[PDB]
Every structure is written in C-alpha cells, then in structure tokens.
Amino acid sequence: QPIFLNVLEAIEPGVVCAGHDNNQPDSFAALLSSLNELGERQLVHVVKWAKALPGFRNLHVDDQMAVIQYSWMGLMVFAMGWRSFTNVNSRMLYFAPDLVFNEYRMHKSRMYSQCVRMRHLSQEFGWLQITPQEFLCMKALLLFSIIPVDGLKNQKFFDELRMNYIKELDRIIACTSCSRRFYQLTKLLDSVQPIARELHQFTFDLLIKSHMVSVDFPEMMAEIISVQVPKILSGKVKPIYFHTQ
Numbered sequence: 641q642p643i644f645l646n647v648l649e650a651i652e653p654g655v656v657c658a659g660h661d662n663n664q665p666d667s668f669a670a671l672l673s674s675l676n677e678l679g680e681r682q683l684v685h686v687v688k689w690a691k692a693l694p695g696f697r698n699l700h701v702d703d704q705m706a707v708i709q710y711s712w713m714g715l716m717v718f719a720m721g722w723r724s725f726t727n728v729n730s731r732m733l734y735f736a737p738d739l740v741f742n743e744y745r746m747h748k749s750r751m752y753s754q755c756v757r758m759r760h761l762s763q764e765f766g767w768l769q770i771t772p773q774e775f776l777c778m779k780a781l782l783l784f785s786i787i788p789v790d791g792l793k794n795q796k797f798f799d800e801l802r803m804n805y806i807k808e809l810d811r812i813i814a815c816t817s818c819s820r821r822f823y824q825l826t827k828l829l830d831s832v833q834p835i836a837r838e839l840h841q842f843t844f845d846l847l848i849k850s851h852m853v854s855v856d857f858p859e860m861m862a863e864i865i866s867v868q869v870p871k872i873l874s875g876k877v878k879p880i881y882f883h884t885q
C-alpha cells in the first residue's frame with residue numbers, strides 16, 4: 641500500500657487563516673501585518689508537520705529547527721503556489737482564504753515582482769499537470785533542500801533522509817517517460833529557491849526598516865529573521881540544487 645503517501649496526506653496541514661480585515665482599504669502596513677500574522681501561524685503548523693515526517697526526528701534536535709527555519713520560505717512559497725492553483729487557477733495569490741492577493745494588492749504590498757514569480761510558479765502546477773501526490777512529495781523534499789555549507793550537526797543522517805525522500809518522489813513517478821517527468825519535477829523544485837531568496841531579501845530589508853513603515857513583526861519572527869535569514873543572504877547557508885544553475 642502507499643504507506644509513504646498515506647503519511648504525507650495524513651499530516652498535511654489544514655486551512656490556515658491570516659486574520660485580515662477585508663473590509664478595510666488595502667494598505668502596505670495592513671497587508672504586511674496580515675502576512676506576518678499568517679507567517680507566525682504557518683510556522684507553528686510547519687514545525688508540527690515536519691516533526692511528523694518519516695525519519696525527521698532522527699536528525700539532531702538543533703538540526704531539526706535549523707532545517708525547518710532555512711527551508712520555511714521555500715516550503716511556504718511552494719504551498720501557497722499550490723493553493724493558488726487549486727483555488728483560483730493561479731489567477732491570484734491565495735495566501736489564505738481571508739488573504740487573497742489581486743493585482744492591486746500585489747502592488748500595494750510593494751511585493752509585486754516577488755508576487756509575479758510566485759504566480760508563475762503557481763501556473764507551472766497547471767502547465768506540468770502536477771498531481772496532488774507529486775505536490776506532497778516535492779513539498780516534503782523541499783524541507784531537505786537548503787543547508788549550511790559547513791554542514792549540520794549530524795549531516796550524515798540528513799544526507800540519508802534527503803536520499804530517501806528523493807527515492808520516494810521517483811517512486812510516485814514510476815507508479816523514458818519517468819526520466820522526462822523526473823527532469824521536469826526537479827527543475828520545478830530548483831525554481832523555488834530563487835523565489836525564496838527574493839523573499840528572504842525582502843523580509844530582511846523590511847525588518848531593518850519595519851519601524852519606518854509601521855510593520856512591527858512579532859518578536860519570534862524578528863529573531864528568526866535576524867539570526868537565520870542573514871546566514872542565507874551571506875552565503876553561509878545555501879540551497880541544494882538538482883541542476884547546475
């Protein structure tokens with residue numbers, strides 16, 4: 641039986657709300673405030689999800705939180721892209737049921753260019769006819785797609801987990817055609833990284849000037865952004881690509 645897929649379906653988070661007031665006129669401050677609130681809620685869900693993944697708990701405890709925090713942006717971009725595809729056919733960005741970005745919001749959020757890349761990703765789910773199961777497997781693999789260049793505390797086990805998740809993805813594909821499909825999916829996975837990078841830069845810059853634009857940022861998010869994001873931006877932590885960029 642599809643044991644692995646059963647597990648991924650079983651732990652997949654349900655709907656997560658942003659808590660946005662859609663009765664108020666759109667503003668940079670209100671939109672980013674709601675995105676940050678959504679972020680805090682999504683991080684809680686991602687931690688619970690990751691810890692329930694096959695073999696994840698065998699990683700050193702410190703490596704567990706590190707990989708979750710390094711891969712989070714990518715995971716969220718990919719998941720949001722899928723939500724946009726399944727709910728509004730990639731027409732708009734479905735951050736949450738109560739936070740759907742139309743073109744006006746993409747502009748007002750001052751995150752237009754990033755939104756364009758995220759919507760493009762959403763469109764690929766349609767162009768490549770990505771199945772819900774391929775989505776689940778790829779998303780799980782994204783958790784193991786970005787690490788410190790100098791390695792994790794137990795880098796050896798991480799390598800083993802990543803290998804096994806790649807094998808499961810190849811598995812669903814097999815369940816010349818397979819070769820072409822694996823190529824397409826790994827190319828799609830690689831495309832998430834540059835998008836996450838743009839968002840890492842944006843969120844970092846926003847934190848540094850949050851006091852001037854009235855964003856605030858919840859205490860926990862500010863800590864993660866100030867400690868982990870710069871490691872990525874400075875090159876100490878790098879994404880793992882399938883293909884040479």
Ligand SMILES: C[C@]12CCC(=O)C[C@@H]1CC[C@@H]1[C@@H]2CC[C@]2(CCOCc3cc(F)cc(F)c3)[C@@H](O)CC[C@@H]12
Pocket residue numbers: 672675676678679682683708709710712713716717720734735736839840842843846861864865868869
């Ligand atoms: C990830 C979100 C929410 C979920 C979603 O559907 C996609 C969306 C993409 C944009 C993110 C937005 C959250 C709020 C952001 C970014 C906040 O980044 C926090 C953060 C950044 C990290 F690199 C690691 C972490 F664990 C947490 C804001 O601070 C600026 C950009 C915002």
